[PDB]
Amino acid sequence: LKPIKLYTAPTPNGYKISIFLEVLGLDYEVQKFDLSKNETKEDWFVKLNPNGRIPTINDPNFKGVDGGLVLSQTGAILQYLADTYDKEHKFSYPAGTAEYYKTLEYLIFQVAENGPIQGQANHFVFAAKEKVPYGINRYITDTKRIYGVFEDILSRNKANDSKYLVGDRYTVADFALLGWAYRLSRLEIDINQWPLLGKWYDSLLKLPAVQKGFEVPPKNA
Template structure:
C-alpha cells in the first residue's frame, strides 16, 4: 500500500527545512504547510505544537504527531530508513552500532549548540529592539566556537559519521545560511572555517539537498524581499 503524504509544518526559518531534507532524501511523500510567524503561538497550530514553534509533522501512516526538529529527524530515519536484511541504512545507521550513537551525539550538538547560538546571534544582530553589542559579541563567539568544533573534526573526514552522508550532516546545513545573510560582517565561513565550507558544498551538491535549498531560497526571497 502506498504511503500517505506526511504533513510538514514549516516557515522561512531554518529548522523546518532540516526535516524537508530528510523527507526528500528518503523519498517520502509529504506536503508542506507554511505557518506565518504571527500565528505559530495561536490556535489551531498550538494544538499541534503547544510550544508554538516549527517544525512539526503529522504522519497519517502511523498516526504520529511530533514537534522538535531533532525528535522528528530521529523518528523519520528510525521509522522509514530501513532495508530488510541489510544493516546499511540509506542515511542513518543500524541501532546499537557505534555509528548509531555517534550520529545521535552530533544531532544533540546541532539542536543544543548550533541552532540556539546561531539563532541568538541573529536575534541580537537584527531583531532585538535595543542594540546590545556585548550580547551580540557573546553569541558571535559561540557561532565561531561551534563552527570551529566542526571545522576541526572535518579536517580529517568528509562526513560527520561513518565515512558517508547521513541525516546528521543535513541537520547542520540551514543554520549556516544565516551567516552570509545576517552575520557576514563578523564571519566568513569560506575563509574562517574552510573545512566546513567544503563540507557544506559537498552536502549541497546532493540532488535532494539542492532541491530543498532552492525551495527555501525562494520562500525566503518572497517573504523578506
C-alpha cells in the same frame, strides 16, 4: 505511503526537515507559517505542538495513532524519519552501534548548541529593538566557537577524508547542521574559513534533494 504533513516556514529549522524528506524521497505536503505574525502561537496549532513553534510533522502512515503521529522538535523528527524511512541505512547507522550513537551526539550538539546560539546571534543582530553589543559579541563569538568544533569533528573522520560527520555517509547530524550553515552568511560569517566545513558544505549543496529542500517553503508569498 501517504503524504507527510509538514508545518513549516522558510527557516533553518524548517529546511532541515524539508531537505531530509527530499533526501529520503518521501512525498509530503506543507502548511506554511508567517513567523512575523505570531501564527505559531495560534490556539489550533499549539494543540498539535505545546511549544508553539515550527516545524512539526503529522505522519498519517503511523498506524498506532488515530489521525497520524504528530511530532515536533527537529531533533526528534529527524530521528523518527531516519528510524522509520531509512531502514536500508543509506543515511543512518544500525541501531545500537557506535556510529549510531555518535550520530546522536552530533545531532544533539547541533540542536542543543548550534541552533540556539546562532539563533541568539541572529536576534541581537537583526531582530532586537535595541543595539546590545554585549549580546552581539557573546553570540557571534560563541557561534564561531561551535563551527570550530564541527571543523574539528570533521577533521577526526580521517578514514573518510572528513567528508562526513560520522563515518562514510551523511546522517541526520549533517542535515541538521546544514540548515543553519546555510544562514551563516547573514551574520557575515564565511563558512570557508573552516576548510573542511567549506568542502562539506559545497558537496551537500550539489545534491538535488538539498537544493530542492532549501526551496520549501518558498521565501515568497
